[PDB]
C-alpha cells in the first residue's frame, strides 16, 4: 500500500488578543501523531500516537525548537500578507501550510509537496517537480521571486525527498500495528418511509471508501445522498450513503462498498 | 471567502440503552477556522467536552470532531449545537440513533 | 518529523 507523512500548520492573527494562535498537527496516513498548540500551557511538541511515544528526549526537544520557530515565521507571515493586501491591522486572518511526502508499495519515494494558502484560498505551492513554484496571484509573485532567490525548492527537495521518506518507514515500522492494519467496514442497512434507503460502513482504516447505489444495477450517482467521512473517535471511519426509492421498489437496489480491507467488495441489499 | 460547516452528530459506537459510549459532533468544510461547538443533553450544554486538534482538508477547509463520555437511554435526547460567522442562527442537530 | 527549514513569505 502507499503512505503518507503529512504536516498541517494554521496559525490566526487576533490583532489586539496577543499574538497568532499556531497549530500544527502531523499525520501518518489518516493517523494523527503530533500536536502543538501554541496557547497551550505545555508550550511543547506532544505524541497523539502510541508508537511516536517510543521516541526519546531528543524528538520531542528538537520538535519543539523547530515548531516553535515554526510559529514565530508564521506570525511575521501574517504581518506580511496584511501588508502585501493593503489590509487592515485590526482583522483576523489565517496562514495555512501542508507538505509531506508520498511512497509507493514499495517504500520509495513518489512524490513531495508543499503548499500554502492565505485566508483559505491557495496561495504558492511548490510544484511535483521540487524544483519551481505557482504562485497564485501577483502578491505570491513576490513570495515566488524571494524563494527563488533564496534557493527554497533545492532545500526543502532535499527533506521530502530524504529526511521526510526516512522518517515516514521508519515510523510505519515502529507503528506497524496501527498504520500497516486494515479495518474492513462493518456493513447494514436502515429502511426509512417513497421510502429512504441507507447504507452504512462503520469501524473502517483507512478512510478511503466507496459507497455506491445501483438501480437495476446501474449507478444512481446523480440521486444518492453522500455524507462526508467521519472519525469515529477510535482510530476508525464511518460514512453512509442513501437514495430515496419509489415505495415497494426496494428490491431493485443494491448498496456496494469497496474498500482495501475487504477480501471482496460488499453488496447489500433491503431484505 | 466563508464556507459554511457541514454537521454530523452520531455516536462512536451502534447505540444500545444503559451501555457507555461517546457522542460525536464531527464539523467539517467551514472557514474560518473560528468556530464554537456544543454538545446538548436535553437542550443543556454538556460541561465536559473535548475536541480534535484543529486541521484541514485538501481545500483548506477545517474539520473539528467534539466528543464527549455518555450512556444513551430511551428518552433523553443529545444533539449538536453550532455557531460560525456563514450562520445567522446557531444550528441545531438532534442524534438521531435511528439514521 | 518537522521540516527544520524556515521559510518567510
Ligand atoms: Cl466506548
Redesign the interface.
Known amino acids: 500500500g502507499s503512505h503518507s507523512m503529512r504536516?498541517?500548520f494554521?496559525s490566526?492573527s487576533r490583532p489586539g488578543r496577543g499574538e497568532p494562535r499556531f497549530?500544527?498537527?502531523?499525520?501518518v496516513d489518516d493517523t494523527?501523531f503530533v500536536?502543538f498548540?501554541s496557547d497551550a500551557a505545555s508550550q511543547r511538541?506532544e505524541p497523539?500516537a502510541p508508537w511516536i511515544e517510543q521516541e526519546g528526549p531528543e524528538?520531542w526537544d528538537g520538535?519543539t525548537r523547530?515548531?516553535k520557530?515554526?510559529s514565530q515565521?508564521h506570525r511575521?507571515?501574517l504581518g506580511?500578507?496584511r501588508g502585501?493586501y493593503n489590509q487592515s491591522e485590526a482583522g483576523?486572518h489565517?496562514?495555512?501550510r501542508?507538505?509531506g511526502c508520498d511512497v509507493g508499495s514499495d517504500w520509495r519515494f513518489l512524490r513531495g509537496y508543499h503548499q500554502?494558502?492565505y485566508?483559505?484560498?491557495?496561495?504558492?505551492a511548490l510544484k511535483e517537480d521540487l524544483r519551481s513554484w505557482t504562485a497564485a496571484d501577483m502578491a505570491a509573485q513576490t513570495?515566488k521571486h524571494?524563494?527563488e532567490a533564496?534557493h527554497?525548492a533545492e532545500?526543502?527537495r532535499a527533506?521530502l525527498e530524504g529526511?521526510?521518506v526516512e522518517?515516514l518507514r521508519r515510523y510505519l515500522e515502529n507503528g506497524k500495528e496501527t498504520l500497516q492494519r486494515t479495518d474492513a467496514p462493518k456493513t447494514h442497512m436502515?429502511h426509512h418511509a417513497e421510502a429512504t434507503l441507507?447504507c452504512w460502513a462503520?469501524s473502517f482504516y483507512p478512510a478511503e471508501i466507496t459507497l455506491t447505489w445501483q438501480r437495476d444495477g446501474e449507478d444512481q450517482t446523480q440521486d444518492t445522498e453522500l455524507?462526508?467521512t467521519?472519525?469515529?473517535?477510535?482510530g476508525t471511519f464511518?460514512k453512509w450513503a442513501a437514495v430515496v426509492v419509489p415505495s415497494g421498489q426496494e428490491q431493485r437496489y443494491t448498496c456496494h462498498v469497496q474498500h482495501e480491507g475487504l477480501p471482496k467488495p460488499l453488496t447489500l441489499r433491503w431484505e | 471567502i466563508q464556507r459554511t460547516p457541514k454537521i454530523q452528530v452520531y455516536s462512536r459506537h451502534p447505540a444500545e440503552n444503559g451501555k457507555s459510549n461517546f457522542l460525536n459532533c464531527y464539523v467539517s468544510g467551514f472557514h474560518p477556522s473560528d468556530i464554537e461547538v456544543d454538545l446538548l443533553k436535553n437542550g443543556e450544554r454538556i460541561e465536559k467536552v473535548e475536541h480534535s486538534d484543529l486541521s484541514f482538508s485538501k481545500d483548506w477547509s477545517f474539520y473539528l470532531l467534539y466528543y464527549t463520555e455518555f450512556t444513551p437511554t430511551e428518552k433523553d435526547e443529545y444533539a449538536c449545537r453550532v455557531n460560525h460567522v456563514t450562520l445567522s442562527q446557531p444550528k441545531i442537530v438532534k442524534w438521531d440513533r435511528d439514521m | 518529523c518537522l521540516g527544520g527549514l524556515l521559510t518567510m513569505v
Open positions: 504536516y498541517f494554521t490566526v497549530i500544527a498537527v502531523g499525520y494523527q500536536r498548540d511538541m497523539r524528538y520538535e523547530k515548531v520557530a515554526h515565521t511575521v507571515d506580511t500578507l502585501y483576523s489565517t496562514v495555512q501542508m507538505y500554502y494558502a485566508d483559505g484560498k491557495d496561495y504558492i513570495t524571494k524563494w533564496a527554497v532545500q526543502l527533506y529526511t521526510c522518517w436502515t441507507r462503520l455524507v462526508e467521519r472519525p469515529a473517535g477510535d464511518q
